[PDB]
């Protein structure tokens, strides 16, 4: 559809009838626009205070990231998990809760297309368990750039149980914002995505945040091709199929290509 699809691959899988289905992905943001023609949203759960329907994105993001899950695998059954309020923040107590609920309903693929600059034993007890549990984690490198020699990968996606996406654009080349370091894993699409918006819009956004719904989505293609393939397989599959671009430290493994990945 948007040309971050098939610059990962992902159109091949689908002329092949490999498109996601009875795979349950998470998308852990700002909830989604549920009424919106273009999506399927299956279920749920809100983990803010003072948002308590997931169904309503009062911010865009999330409705945003679900859509490019759903353009990669248009058959995945997404979940709104809403842990981030109207202004995209959320609390790492909301985070780490909607995580846990992912776990508890058996969601096959999580996208975290959130980052945030420190840690925890709670939020690397909630992945690692997740991780544990058989479920692909996927979240956004960050938006921080480069930082001398330090890497600049956010958590959660600097655990490593977590597939850490940066952004590219449409020539392959690393986006200036996209965060660096060891723990970044692949690149996916990540500048201008064209997505769904609340209220039955499409816009563009940009950032490792657009990058990491198109793994997600990858993910479950493969899960749709692999239904007995363990996490661990999904992800090993992504990252030795990559198209190789620079450096490990600004392109991880590179390029997801969902193609070659799914075998
Ligand atoms: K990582």
């Not at 998470?26 to 626009?33: H, K, L, R, T």
């Not at 909301?94 to 999580?110: F, L, Q, S």
């Not at 597939?163 to 060891?182: E, L, M, T």
Request: hydrophobic content about 40%; some cysteine; proline content about 5%.
């Amino acid at each position: 559809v948007p040309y971050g699809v098939s610059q990962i691959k992902a159109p091949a899988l689908h002329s092949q009838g490999y498109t996601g289905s009875n795979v349950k992905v998470a998308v852990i943001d700002s909830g989604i626009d549920s009424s919106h023609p273009d999506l399927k949203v299956a279920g749920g759960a809100s983990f803010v205070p003072s948002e308590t329907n997931p169904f309503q994105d009062n911010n865009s993001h999330g409705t945003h990231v679900a859509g490019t899950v759903a353009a990669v695998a248009p058959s995945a059954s997404l979940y709104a998990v809403k842990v981030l309020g109207a202004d995209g923040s959320g609390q790492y107590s909301w985070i780490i809760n909607g995580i846990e609920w992912a776990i508890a309903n058996n969601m096959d693929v999580i996208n975290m297309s959130l980052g945030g600059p420190s840690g925890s034993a709670a939020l690397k007890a909630a992945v690692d368990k997740a991780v544990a549990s058989g479920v692909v984690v996927v979240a956004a490198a960050g938006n921080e750039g480069t930082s001398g020699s330090s890497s600049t990968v956010g958590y959660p996606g600097k655990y490593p149980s977590v597939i850490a996406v940066g952004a590219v654009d449409s020539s392959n080349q690393r986006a200036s914002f996209s965060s660096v370091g060891p723990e970044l894993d692949v690149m996916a699409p990540g500048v201008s995505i064209q997505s769904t918006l609340p209220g039955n819009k499409y816009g563009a956004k940009s950032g490792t945040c657009m990058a990491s719904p198109h793994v997600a989505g990858a993910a479950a293609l493969i899960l749709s091709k692999h239904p007995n393939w363990t996490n661990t397989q999904v992800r090993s599959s992504l990252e030795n199929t990559t198209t190789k671009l620079g450096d490990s430290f600004y392109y991880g493994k590179g390029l997801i290509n969902v193609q070659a990945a799914a075998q």
